[PDB]
Amino acid sequence: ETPVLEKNNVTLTGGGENVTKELKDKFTSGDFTVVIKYNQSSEKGLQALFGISNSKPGQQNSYVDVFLRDNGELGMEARDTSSNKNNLVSRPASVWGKYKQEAVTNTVAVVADSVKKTYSLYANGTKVVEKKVDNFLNIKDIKGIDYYMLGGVKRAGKTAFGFNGTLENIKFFNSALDEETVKKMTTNAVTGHLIYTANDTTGSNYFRIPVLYTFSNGRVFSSIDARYGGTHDFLNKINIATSYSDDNGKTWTKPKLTLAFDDFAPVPLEWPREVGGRDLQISGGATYIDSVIVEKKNKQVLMFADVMPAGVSFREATRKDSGYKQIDGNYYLKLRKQGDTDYNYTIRENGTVYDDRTNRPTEFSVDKNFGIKQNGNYLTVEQYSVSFENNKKTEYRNGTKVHMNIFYKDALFKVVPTNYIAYISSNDHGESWSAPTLLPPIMGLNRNAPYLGPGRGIIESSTGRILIPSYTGKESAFIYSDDNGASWKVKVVPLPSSWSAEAQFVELSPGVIQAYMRTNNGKIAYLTSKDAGTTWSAPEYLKFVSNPSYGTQLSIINYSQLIDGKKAVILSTPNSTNGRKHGQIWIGLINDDNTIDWRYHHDVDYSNYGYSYSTLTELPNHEIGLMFEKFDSWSRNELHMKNVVPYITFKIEDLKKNL
Ligand SMILES: CC(=O)N[C@H]1[C@H]([C@H](O)[C@H](O)CO)O[C@@](O)(C(=O)O)C[C@@H]1O
C-alpha cells in the first residue's frame, strides 16, 4: 500500500500549509491512516499535526485531526456539525518533548477503520489506544470537507491549533493499515529507551517502580514492578522483574520474572481506561511489590520486596499482628488451618509444620519458596486466569496445576493477612537467585512489617553497616545489619505527620548519613545521622521543591567524581504543585560542614510532562543512568498505560545547568 500523499521536511511556526489540491477527494472509502514523523519547536498550546475540515462559516465542528498537548498527550478528533457527532480518542503521556536541550523526533499515527468502527493511535512503536465508538465518523461521513492542511485545522477561514515544529515526514493513506505495519512504521530512536515493554518476556502489559543499580563488576542492573491488572498498587497481581546490561546501558537482557507467585498466570490484560471501569481490580493474586537493591562488601547482591498475600492490600493489611509467634525464644511464621479460627500452627525447623497446641510435628511442611507438602508430596491448587472478551472482567480456574502456597487464597494453611518483607541473594550478580527469606518480626510481634522505600540500600563506609530504607505510615524504619546481613534490626523514628516516607540514603562523610524522603506536606524532608544511623536529627526540608501533599518517591545517589572540586550527590524528583510532573535532576555539592550546596539542576523534558517514581545510578564510565515513570502515576486520568517507563543516560555536562 502506497500513500496518496507524502511530504518531507515541512517547518512551520503556527501558520500551517494548505495541501487541499494534493488531497481533495482522494479518500475514496473514507478510511484513513496518517503517519507523522515530527519534532516540536514549542510544546505550548493545543497543536494539530494535520487537519481535514469543512472550512466554511458555521462548519467549525466538521473536522478530523491528530493533536498534541503540552503534557505529551496524543489524541485525535473526528467531528461532524449537522449530525452532532463528536469523537475524541487519546492517551496521556504518548510522546516526548525535549531531551538534553533538543527537540525530540517522535513518529505517531492514526488509523480509522469503518468496518470495525475503531480509531487507533500509535506513538514511537506503541499502539497507545484503540477505541470503538458508536458515533464513528470516517472522512466521507463528515459533510462538506473542503480543506486539507498540515500543521493546523481550518475552521471558519482561520487556522486553528497551529503546529510549531517540523513535519519531517508525513504520509496519508486512504485505507486502514494493519496494526503490525503501523507499529513498525512508528518505531524510532525513542522506542529503544524502553527496557520493559508490554507483553515482553514478563507477560505484563504494565510496569511501575523502576530501580537501577551498578554493581562492582561494571554490570548495570534493573528491577521493576510488573503490574498485570493495570497499574493499581492494589488489589492486583504484581511480580518483580529484572534486566541487566554489561555494556554501560546500551543493550539489556530480555526481562526475567525474579520474584513471582503463580496462583495467577502472568498474562497481558487490556485494563479499561474509562471513568468507573478504570477503578476495576482483580480479586488479587499473591504479590511482590516495591523492590530495593544493595550489593554487599563481598559482592553478594541482595534484593528486598514487600510480600502481600492474595486479596491483601496495604489499606487492608492488619497493623496489629506480625504473622509470627515466639516459641522458646524463636520467631516462627504462624499458620491458620482452613476451618480454624485460631492460628494453631507454626513453621519450625526444616519447614516442618508444628501443631502449637501439642508441640508435635504434623504431616505438613513448607519448602523454601512457601509451597506446602503433606507427607513429602506437594499439595496443589489450580491457577487463575483473568479475561475480558471485551467488556466484562472474568476470573477463572484455567486448568494449570501449581503448588499450594501459604500466601494463596486457596491454601489449606494460610499466613496472617498482612504485609511482609522478603529478600533474596545472588552470587553471580543477578544471573541466579536464592530462595526467599522473610524478615523476622523486627517491629515486634504485634505490629506489621514496614513497607520498603523503593530504590537502593547502602553500606556505610566507616562501620560496614547495611541500611535498607522503609516506613510504616507514621514512622521512618531504617532497617540495618551490623554483621554483613546475617541478622537484621531496625531504628524506628517517629515523624511529624503520617508521611508515606519512602526514603533513600546518602553518605556525606564517614559516619554521617542523610535520609531523604517523601512527606505529606509538599516538601522533601531529610533527616541526619552522625553515628552511622543509630540516632537521627529532626527533619529539615529542601527549599526548592514544592509538590502536592500526596508527594512522590525520589532517587538520590552519591557520585564518585568531584564536581567543581567537591563531593557530589545527585537527586531525581518531580517538582510541581499541579501533579507528578516537571522532573528535575539536581546536583548537590557537599560543603566542608556537611551541608549541601544545591548548585545545578536539569529539567527532564517540559514542565507539564509527566514524571513520577525514578531511579538513578552512576554508570561505570561515570555517566548517569535514569529510569523513570514518564507519566503521572497518581492521577486517575493516567492509569493503565503501556510503555511509559523509559531509561535515559546523561553526561555530567548535560546536568550542570541553571547556575
Ligand atoms: C482536543 C480538544 O480538546 N478540542 C476541543 C477544543 C479545545 O479544548 C479548545 O479549542 C482549546 O484549544 O475546544 C472545543 O470547544 C472546540 O474548539 O470546538 C471542543 C474540542 O473538542
Q: Indicate if 570 and 443 belong to the same structural domain.
A: yes
CATH number at residue 27: 2.60.120.200
Method of determination used here: X-ray
Within its chain, how far is the Cα of 6 from the centroid? 37
Q: Indicate if 170 and 255 belong to the same structural domain.
A: no
Ligand 1 atom with the shortest distance to the CA of 86: 21
H or E segment and range at residue 590: strand 583-590
Q: CA 343, CA 345: separation in Å to the nearest integer?
A: 6
Q: CA 539, CA 521: separation in Å to the nearest integer?
A: 12
Pairing relationship of beta strands 489-494 and 475-481 according to DSSP bridges: antiparallel
Residue 141 has φ and ψ, to the nearest 5°, of -75, -20
Order of strands, edge to edge, in the sheet holding 118-123?
5-13, 164-173, 32-40, 106-113, 118-123, 126-132
Q: CA 612, CA 605: separation in Å to the nearest integer?
A: 13
DSSP 371: B
Q: CA 89, CA 132: separation in Å to the nearest integer?
A: 9
Which of 417, 432, 459 is where one domain is finished? Answer: 417
Contacts of 396 (CB under 8 A, 6+ apart): 384, 385, 387
Q: Indicate if 313 and 328 belong to the same structural domain.
A: no
**Cell (9 digits) for 584:** 528535575
Residue 46 C-alpha to ligand 1 middle, in angstroms?
8
Beta strands in 193-300 (DSSP E): 206-214, 220-227, 238-245, 256-259, 287-295
DSSP 349: G
Cα–Cα nearest to 162, from 73, 36, 68 = 68
Residue 65 C-alpha to ligand 1 middle, in angstroms?
11
Count of alpha carbons within 13 angstroms of residue 318, beta-carbon side = 11
Question: Mind giving me the DSSP string for 458-481?
Answer: EE-TTT--EEEEEE-SSEEEEEEE
Residue 15 C-alpha to ligand 1 middle, in angstroms?
18
CA dihedral 602, 607, 613, 618 (to 10 degrees): -10
CA dihedral 68, 70, 73, 76 (to 10 degrees): -30
Alpha helices of 136-268 — where are they, by DSSP H? 179-186
Q: CA 458, CA 494: separation in Å to the nearest integer?
A: 22
> Are residues 456 and 211 in contact, defined by beta-carbon separation less than 8 angstroms?
yes
SS (H, E, C) 114-174: CCCCEEEEEECCEEEEEEECCCCCCHHHCCCCCEEEECCEEECCEEECCCEEEEEEEEEEC
From residue 394, how far is each of 13, 234, 276, 306, 391 by CA, in Å?
50, 18, 17, 27, 10
From residue 223, how far is each of 19, 118, 433, 456 by CA, in Å?
48, 36, 13, 11
Ligand 1 atom with the shortest distance to the CA of 88: 21
Q: CA 137, CA 76: separation in Å to the nearest integer?
A: 12
Amino acid making up residue 512: V
Residues β-bridged to residue 587: 570, 600
> Are residues 476 and 492 in contact, defined by beta-carbon separation less than 8 angstroms?
yes
N residues, the chain = 659
**Cell (9 digits) for 146:** 473542503
CATH number at residue 609: 2.120.10.10
Q: Indicate if 211 and 75 belong to the same structural domain.
A: no
Active site residues per annotation: 233, 502, 613
Ligand 1 atom with the shortest distance to the CA of 69: 1
Order of strands, edge to edge, in the sheet holding 614-618?
614-618, 624-628, 647-650
Q: Whose CA is nearest to atom 4 of ligand 1?
A: 77
Residues β-bridged to residue 571: 556, 586
> At 370, is the secondary structure helix, strand, or coil?
coil
Residue 22 has φ and ψ, to the nearest 5°, of -85, 0
H or E segment and range at residue 655: helix 652-655
Residue 134 C-alpha to ligand 1 middle, in angstroms?
21
Contacts of 602 (CB under 8 A, 6+ apart): 584, 585, 650, 654, 655, 656, 657, 658
Residues β-bridged to residue 38: 106, 167
Phi-psi region of 484 (alpha: psi -120 to 50; beta: other; left: phi over 0): left
H or E segment and range at residue 109: strand 106-113
Stated in angstroms to one decimal place, the resolution of this structure is 2.2
Looking up cell 537484621 gives 488
Burial of 503 (0-12, 13-18, 19+ CB in 10 A): buried
Q: Indicate if 474 and 616 belong to the same structural domain.
A: yes
From residue 215, how far is each of 245, 461, 464 by CA, in Å?
11, 16, 17
Q: CA 50, CA 67: separation in Å to the nearest integer?
A: 8
**Cell (9 digits) for 475:** 514512622
Q: Indicate if 115 and 225 belong to the same structural domain.
A: no
Count of alpha carbons within 13 angstroms of residue 461, beta-carbon side = 9
The structural domain count of the chain equals 3
Residue 276 has φ and ψ, to the nearest 5°, of 85, -70
Ligand 1 atom with the shortest distance to the CA of 65: 1
Cα–Cα nearest to 445, from 334, 541, 551 = 334
Contacts of 428 (CB under 8 A, 6+ apart): none
User: How many other C-beta atoms are found inside a 10 Å radius of the C-beta of residue 92?
Assistant: 23
Ligand 1 atom with the shortest distance to the CA of 45: 12
**Cell (9 digits) for 132:** 470503538
Q: CA 505, CA 470: separation in Å to the nearest integer?
A: 11
Q: Which domain holds residue 17?
A: 1-191
Q: Indicate if 62 and 187 belong to the same structural domain.
A: yes
Residue 357 has φ and ψ, to the nearest 5°, of -70, -35
Burial of 401 (0-12, 13-18, 19+ CB in 10 A): exposed
Q: Whose CA is nearest to atom 15 of ligand 1?
A: 61
Q: CA 629, CA 611: separation in Å to the nearest integer?
A: 6
Q: Whose CA is nearest to atom 12 of ligand 1?
A: 46
Ligand 1 atom with the shortest distance to the CA of 161: 12
Cα–Cα nearest to 370, from 435, 290, 308 = 435
Residue 156 C-alpha to ligand 1 middle, in angstroms?
14
Cα–Cα nearest to 223, from 605, 649, 613 = 613
Pocket test of ligand 1: the residue of 44, 68, 77 to mutate, having most ligand atoms within 8 Å of its CB, is 77
**Cell (9 digits) for 90:** 487519546
Pocket test of ligand 1: the residue of 43, 44, 46, 90 to mutate, having most ligand atoms within 8 Å of its CB, is 46
Question: Mind giving me the DSSP string for 19-32?
Answer: -HHHHTT--SSS-E
Q: Whose CA is nearest to atom 9 of ligand 1?
A: 46
Q: CA 478, CA 516: separation in Å to the nearest integer?
A: 12
Q: CA 396, CA 352: separation in Å to the nearest integer?
A: 32
Count of alpha carbons within 13 angstroms of residue 250, beta-carbon side = 6
Q: Whose CA is nearest to atom 8 of ligand 1?
A: 46
Cα–Cα nearest to 627, from 577, 563, 583, 567 = 583
Q: Indicate if 452 and 407 belong to the same structural domain.
A: no
> Are residues 621 and 216 in contact, defined by beta-carbon separation less than 8 angstroms?
no
Q: Indicate if 492 and 398 belong to the same structural domain.
A: no
Residue 274 C-alpha to ligand 1 middle, in angstroms?
20
Q: Indicate if 1 and 57 belong to the same structural domain.
A: yes
Which of 170, 191, 212 is where one domain is finished? Answer: 191
Ligand 1 atom with the shortest distance to the CA of 67: 1
Q: Indicate if 263 and 385 belong to the same structural domain.
A: no
> Are residues 70 and 579 in contact, defined by beta-carbon separation less than 8 angstroms?
no
Q: CA 314, CA 418: separation in Å to the nearest integer?
A: 8
Q: Whose CA is nearest to atom 11 of ligand 1?
A: 46
From residue 617, how far is each of 197, 251, 453, 460 by CA, in Å?
21, 16, 16, 17
Q: CA 169, CA 12: separation in Å to the nearest integer?
A: 13
Which of 145, 170, 191 is where one domain is finished? Answer: 191
Cα–Cα nearest to 214, from 289, 298, 290, 299 = 299
Burial of 483 (0-12, 13-18, 19+ CB in 10 A): exposed
User: How many other C-beta atoms are found inside a 10 Å radius of the C-beta of residue 339?
Assistant: 6
Residue 88 C-alpha to ligand 1 middle, in angstroms?
10
Q: Whose CA is nearest to atom 20 of ligand 1?
A: 77
Cα–Cα nearest to 245, from 540, 646, 625 = 625
Return the ∠ at Cα 489 (arms to 534 and 479), rounded to 5°.
75
Residue 64 C-alpha to ligand 1 middle, in angstroms?
12
Residues framing ligand 1 (Cβ under 6 A): 46, 67, 75, 77, 88
Q: Indicate if 86 and 220 belong to the same structural domain.
A: no
Within its chain, how far is the Cα of 291 from the centroid? 12
Residue 583 C-alpha to ligand 1 middle, in angstroms?
28
Residues β-bridged to residue 602: 585
Q: Whose CA is nearest to atom 14 of ligand 1?
A: 61
From residue 396, how far is each of 235, 404, 413 by CA, in Å?
17, 17, 22
CATH number at residue 340: 2.40.220.10
> Are residues 377 and 396 in contact, defined by beta-carbon separation less than 8 angstroms?
no
Longest CA–CA span in the chain (Å) reads 91
Q: CA 214, CA 11: separation in Å to the nearest integer?
A: 42
Contacts of 101 (CB under 8 A, 6+ apart): none
